[PDB]
Amino acid sequence: MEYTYDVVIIGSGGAGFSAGLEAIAAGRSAVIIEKMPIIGGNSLISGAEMNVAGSWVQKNMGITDSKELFISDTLKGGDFKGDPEMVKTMVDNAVGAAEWLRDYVKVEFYPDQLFQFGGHSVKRALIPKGHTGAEVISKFSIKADEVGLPIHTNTKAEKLIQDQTGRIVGVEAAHNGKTITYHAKRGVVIATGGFSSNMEMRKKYNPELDERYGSTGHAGGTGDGIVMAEKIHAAAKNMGYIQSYPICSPTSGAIALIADSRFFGAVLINQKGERFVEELERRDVISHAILAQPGRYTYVLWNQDIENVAHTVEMHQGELKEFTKDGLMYKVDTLEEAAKVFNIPEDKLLSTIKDVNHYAATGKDEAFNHRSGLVDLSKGPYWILKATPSVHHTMGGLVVDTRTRVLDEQGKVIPGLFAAGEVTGLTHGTNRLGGNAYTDIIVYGRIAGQEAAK
Amino acid sequence: MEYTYDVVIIGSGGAGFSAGLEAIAAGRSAVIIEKMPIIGGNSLISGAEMNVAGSWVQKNMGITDSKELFISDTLKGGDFKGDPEMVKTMVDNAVGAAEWLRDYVKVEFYPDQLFQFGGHSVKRALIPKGHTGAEVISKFSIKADEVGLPIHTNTKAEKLIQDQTGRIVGVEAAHNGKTITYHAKRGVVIATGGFSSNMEMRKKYNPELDERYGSTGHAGGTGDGIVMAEKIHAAAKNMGYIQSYPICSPTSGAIALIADSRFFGAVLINQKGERFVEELERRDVISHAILAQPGRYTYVLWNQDIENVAHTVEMHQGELKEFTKDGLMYKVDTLEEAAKVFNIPEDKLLSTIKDVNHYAATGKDEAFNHRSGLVDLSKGPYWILKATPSVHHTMGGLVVDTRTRVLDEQGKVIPGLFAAGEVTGLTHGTNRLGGNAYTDIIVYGRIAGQEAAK
Amino acid sequence: MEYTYDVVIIGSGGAGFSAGLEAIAAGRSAVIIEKMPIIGGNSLISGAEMNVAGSWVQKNMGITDSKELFISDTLKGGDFKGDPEMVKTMVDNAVGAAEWLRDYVKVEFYPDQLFQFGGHSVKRALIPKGHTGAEVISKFSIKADEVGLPIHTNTKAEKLIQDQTGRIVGVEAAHNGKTITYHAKRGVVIATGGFSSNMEMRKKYNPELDERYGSTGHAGGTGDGIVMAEKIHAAAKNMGYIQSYPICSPTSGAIALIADSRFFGAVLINQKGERFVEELERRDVISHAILAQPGRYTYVLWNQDIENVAHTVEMHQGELKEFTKDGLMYKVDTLEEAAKVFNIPEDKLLSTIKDVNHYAATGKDEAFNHRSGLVDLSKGPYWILKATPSVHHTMGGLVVDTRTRVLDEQGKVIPGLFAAGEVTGLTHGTNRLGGNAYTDIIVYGRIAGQEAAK
Amino acid sequence: MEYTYDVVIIGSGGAGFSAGLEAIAAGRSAVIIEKMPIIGGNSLISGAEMNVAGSWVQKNMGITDSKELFISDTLKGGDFKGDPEMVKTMVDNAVGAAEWLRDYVKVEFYPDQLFQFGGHSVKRALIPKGHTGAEVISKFSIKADEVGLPIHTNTKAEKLIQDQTGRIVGVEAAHNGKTITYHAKRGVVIATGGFSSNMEMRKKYNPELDERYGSTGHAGGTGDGIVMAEKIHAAAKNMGYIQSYPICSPTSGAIALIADSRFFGAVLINQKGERFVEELERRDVISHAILAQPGRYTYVLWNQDIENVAHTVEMHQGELKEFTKDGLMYKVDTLEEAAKVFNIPEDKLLSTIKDVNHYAATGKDEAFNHRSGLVDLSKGPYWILKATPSVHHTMGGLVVDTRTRVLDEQGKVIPGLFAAGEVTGLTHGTNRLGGNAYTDIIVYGRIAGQEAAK
Numbered sequence A, B, C, D: 001m002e003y004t005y006d007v008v009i010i011g012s013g014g015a016g017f018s019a020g021l022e023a024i025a026a027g028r029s030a031v032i033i034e035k036m037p038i039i040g041g042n043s044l045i046s047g048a049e050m051n052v053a054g055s056w057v058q059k060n061m062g063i064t065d066s067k068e069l070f071i072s073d074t075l076k077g078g079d080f081k082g083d084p085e086m087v088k089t090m091v092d093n094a095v096g097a098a099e100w101l102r103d104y105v106k107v108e109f110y111p112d113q114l115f116q117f118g119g120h121s122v123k124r125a126l127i128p129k130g131h132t133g134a135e136v137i138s139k140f141s142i143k144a145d146e147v148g149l150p151i152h153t154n155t156k157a158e159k160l161i162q163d164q165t166g167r168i169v170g171v172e173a174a175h176n177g178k179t180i181t182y183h184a185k186r187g188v189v190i191a192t193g194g195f196s197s198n199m200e201m202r203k204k205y206n207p208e209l210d211e212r213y214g215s216t217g218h219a220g221g222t223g224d225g226i227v228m229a230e231k232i233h234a235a236a237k238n239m240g241y242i243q244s245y246p247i248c249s250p251t252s253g254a255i256a257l258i259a260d261s262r263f264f265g266a267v268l269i270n271q272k273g274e275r276f277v278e279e280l281e282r283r284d285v286i287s288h289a290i291l292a293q294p295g296r297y298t299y300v301l302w303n304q305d306i307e308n309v310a311h312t313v314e315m316h317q318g319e320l321k322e323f324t325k326d327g328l329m330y331k332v333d334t335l336e337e338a339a340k341v342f343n344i345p346e347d348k349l350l351s352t353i354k355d356v357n358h359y360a361a362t363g364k365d366e367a368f369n370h371r372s373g374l375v376d377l378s379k380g381p382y383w384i385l386k387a388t389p390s391v392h393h394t395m396g397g398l399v400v401d402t403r404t405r406v407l408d409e410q411g412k413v414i415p416g417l418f419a420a421g422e423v424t425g426l427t428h429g430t431n432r433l434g435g436n437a438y439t440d441i442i443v444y445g446r447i448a449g450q451e452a453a454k
Ligand SMILES: Cc1cc2nc3c(=O)[nH]c(=O)nc-3n(C[C@H](O)[C@H](O)[C@H](O)COP(=O)(O)OP(=O)(O)OC[C@H]3O[C@@H](n4cnc5c(N)ncnc54)[C@H](O)[C@@H]3O)c2cc1C
Pocket: A010, A011, A012, A013, A014, A015, A016, A033, A034, A035, A036, A038, A039, A040, A041, A042, A043, A044, A045, A046, A047, A048, A049, A050, A051, A155, A156, A157, A158, A191, A192, A193, A194, A216, A217, A218, A220, A221, A222, A224, A225, A255, A392, A393, A420, A421, A422, A423, A434, A435, A436, A437, A438, A439, A441
């Protein structure tokens, strides 16, 4: 079997859909091939909250942002290990990318709602209607059907076709036991995401990312795009830069949204009954601290007073039922009960909370310098939850320029090969700021399809 | 009609009940005479939250307070216009007074709950069961009945009886049109409270305390004790030092508890549609600012987001129904609606909230330096409330020493005359810190009855 | 003897010179009569630092101020007891007043230097060349000589001349034992300053302003203008609102500039060897706290480390020589020496500094919440200084409107009578912010002369 | 040539001298072999400031520290990548190590002086007399001569002698072209320091540590100990964790102490005339930001106002003369001059400083959130300096247990082989806190000699 298009995009996430739509919009034949039976990848189960400095939503609310502030926030976030030109091009194209989603893809964002992720000087993350990436992916596939962009599911790319001159001329994929050849007259776009769900690749670049980390993403995020491109001598950088989330379900690895009480006074307790880290540190700092505790897990503990402010138990009854059923979460009346259900030394826990109560009563956390201020925990009932970290984002990946052209190890452009999204590795640095991944995949996805189409 | 006791106490508030119980406990005949048909005065409708440094409740929760911190908090609160010896004696006797209420009067405080009023470095205010002064007054009258302390209601003291030597030998009161003579063999205790409900006396020492201020207290607080004592040449000081609460009902003058959203993001708006004061300033600073606005009133405005955190609308449905019925509070869907219901200039209000939204999105209130941080007000619905200040506490009053003995204008002790509670004027200074009035009346009430009984 | 002018100005300070120059500029005869043998009054010995929002100096440095911020800073500073219309007119005319001094009077301000007084959200106080009011007064008298504005020194106004209709028609003054009559065809301007140097008038409106307060001003500031105007039934308000400076020479009453180490780590110690107030509180709060300590004085203590940062000893050798000669300041090698020279209990002082050293080593002042952070005092040598407060500014005075017209007790305009400067009492409220007095006297001085000339 | 001792220590730094003295103190023959012609290594040119929680100096000053705070400060500093047992053993033995230096080695620390490095909650770093490591090394060699500990300079260890059973039985060294055999009957101690001066080894574990980084250390710090131990199959970990200092001389690589004005208001400017990083960020964050600027260097700029507070120009005249002579530092009168001497775009620099002046005048750095507050730079003269980062500390190295026993790659103890100091790699993590390296080398140096001697 043999297909021939101008642009062959691998991956039906946000990056691939943007590349595919821009290629078709330029008057070229394109196709998206998707390995999974469903479209969307991690972009589907994502919050799809998009950081934009100068958005129409900010103007509606009276918020004045700045592109240079957005740029410096992102660079300082990755400890200046990110590429300044890649960050600048992302920030400079964020407004146009968000307006493109609103006007071309018909994505509906909330007009009077934004979120401020950690490390952002100004609240700037747009929120899609429904607080889900499905709003974006549904509008993408609807738009793709209107413009005639075919999406081939259950089609796994396995080999890049390189001709005598070194130009990438197509993709060899597997569909229904059979070898499909995808001839790409103009370019191939690699939009395959990261490898957070590839434990053996994780260990290769960081032996500590073994079973003590879960994955917050889908099963398909296995880094196929990096292995494919490297076999034709593409460069990969920063493969060890990995973003984690510290409070995840030990069973599934998913982010434990019921433990968002951490932002309202919840404390992290280890098996000894002690606090060990500021609950509002960087996500990677908290995960590393959790892995230094006995057993490599932590407890999350709060009371009704905090729930009356956070409402995380009320807003996430599914997690409440699952965690309690699996024996990883209890609701108890007293701190003594909270200790015994998890065999925490009672006297050491009572003394720990007493210190928290004192820190709350004087405004200073003498133990870990809580930057918001601890909250009294004298009254119950209490919720106590057991959590472990999970790998969230692989900042490393393929080496590209600001035109998404893939470079080899000497830094030379590989003709016909483009990459955008989490599969690239030059934008974020050592820490991926919240809401920045979606700005990255839409901005560079659009560029990839525009560059591939010429 | 003629009565003869050892100690005659005027006033059945917290100060009088403490004096009466201590006098009877010393083996002397005593009586409390009360002008109103009910007992309790302002102590009854009070929150009865009592500031104590070193209380058993603090120890239960692990909080470590300090008496010197409590002393310096109180002195700095009244801008060091209070008497240092009066503050020291109050703080040094706070633990014994609170334990006396718990052990002798059988007052029930919460074991795991405290409140931190403004200006207190450590959370230290005890809370009675039920969050009401009725818990204290009910236990007082029960204890008074057990120990044989008669309380004569509908008996208004009108003249102090002074003998040839200048000693105060009794009280002349009015009961049922008739003149009752109360012979006091050992002492008279003046425990009549303040004059927050005496508008003409308020204007005498501050012409600005006219109809633009309400009263948060009961009708009986009219300063009878100061006029009585001054006619036998007792000294009064600081009569102009008055404590106000800025957000009160324009109809009743009571504290508007539904407007506690001020501590969660609610903004104060004047008739022009502008903010004019930091919403977390001192209570006297906010009241003075409110009286500088057009009409001498202010608006309080918040939204569902704040109610989801403050719950003040849910916890005070009575105020919601009354304020809305009286046309002083509206729930609306949009800010445009919030402007029109009170004829606030719409464009100026929309621009004001836009600035608040920007201040919330950047953490800095460039207009009034909100010390907690403003909260976004882009989404509705909204509550908007009209409020005016009310006189809350008259810090001035009779001149006493730390033994509650009343002094004349040369500072000499008037024999047989004692005073305790809000009727005295040397403890608090220019600003009465929250929870400090109850520590004052119990500590010095007990001293008055002990000194009067000898 | 008899003189006849259009406008007769009483007082050769900043307010009078502005009124006199504006009257002459309008084509009218004017005269300034001065009681002292020298011109300038308190405006001469002043720092002459002038608060201006939107000044050319701010623009030179890149600082963006706001008039509404300036207005709200001033109003919140006087606890909203100031007149909002008087503050608004002062702030709105501050730029024009400062430009008038620079362009008409030829006052030289520094182009790249400003000062930020307490309570100002933005650094906005202009600084005259030489850091002295003599720069302003010298340029005033030079300009007055050029425009023909006669100044009569040794001429004390003692009575306002009021005609049959109630119009103020002139001034009766005393010069060389003889009664001079000053006929004022258009108006009289009262520009006599405050009464900080009138102890008996101070006690009249505040019995606490006796010998325990000095005066930072000149001997002529005795409130003659208020007594004069009140005898023709002018209104005076807020006479008890007084501004103090806490750290002054006990001998002279002048501000102790060598004790500006307070802004760099110096601590205030009482006779018991203890701290008693946050060293960075409001000036009135510190003065009141000083008067609550044993003896009604305080000690100021710092070391070479602070001098290496503050340089106050180096920059004020005159005060160093005078205070040391008078036995009110010592330089010692050890804290033990610092205790014995003033008979401070040594053990209590050593423990106090140990607490300061701990507070400095942890960043939190647990005793008084030092808002800048204490500085270690382990090493010497040390300077220790004895200081007492002094009355600095009398915010009260004559009642005027925003056109400087004097009002009677019913609030009615007294024809021909105007007042400007510290002699008026409606601008500042309960606390006069630094740099605001000079904006007040120039803005309203100019208005007085313009209104008097018509 | 052949020598036989019980313990053979390689390296005459702080770690080796501690091991050697403890071995001799246990009654065993020992020797220190030193590759350089001088003793001391990096410990000699070090500040020798030693972090100790609970030191006698803290007690002298009244400072109360905590070992658990010290532990959590160190762990959070290295982002919890350090070994918790290695940090705990260091902190728990810090007091005994410092007292050992004071009492046994006779090191003189200041009794009333400490320093607080970044990331330490309490000021805790002891300071040796003279502010130099030479105070420690001089006392070490004096003590070594008294106890008979021979030190062989110009003797470079090149091969570890391993016997048939795998036990490390001695050292083969080179002295004067000849092969010296050092038989170690009990143990060998590797105390060779780090590899900050080994550029090719630096690039091996981090290709970015090339010529754009200097070295702040001596020429001998070339990682010989790691290569030696790895050839007998010892494990090395974290070799990429490197500590940098951002402001160093481009010529020598030494830390530019004259640029300590950064802690007083100095700003970092790139070639474009812009700020690019908060001047008070982490040292690694600033270095990475400097390498992202045009040319991979930065400028440091301050004025006389800051020098009047920092005194860094006055205290470091040698650097002033050298940097100016080499054309890497200028003193100029105006900002225009400061731009032209380094060909910085003048208009962009003037606008940058104007923003700083505004940020200083309002207290908020809107561009990079300066945590101390910027300082006005309107007036000159100015100093402007060109600086580049240098590698300061190699946190990685040999794998040991808390008894300094070297482990192989399966984690098994290699008999007779011990290591202590910067040559080990498990203590500090990703960021070496200031003053922590000296606590590490003394505590584990002592342990090494005690363990080697048995
Ligand atoms: C739970 C969660 C919440 C998140 N929330 C946010 C948020 O609020 N804001 C934000 O900015 N970021 C968020 N992120 C991260 C962000 O959404 C992702 O980094 C981003 O969606 C990556 O998009 P992508 O198109 O590059 O990859 P993907 O969306 O993962 O697309 C890759 C696709 O390619 C397919 N594919 C892979 N290999 C092959 C192959 N060999 N052949 C064919 N197809 C292949 C995959 O199956 C997948 O469908 C979140 C992530 C998670 C897991």
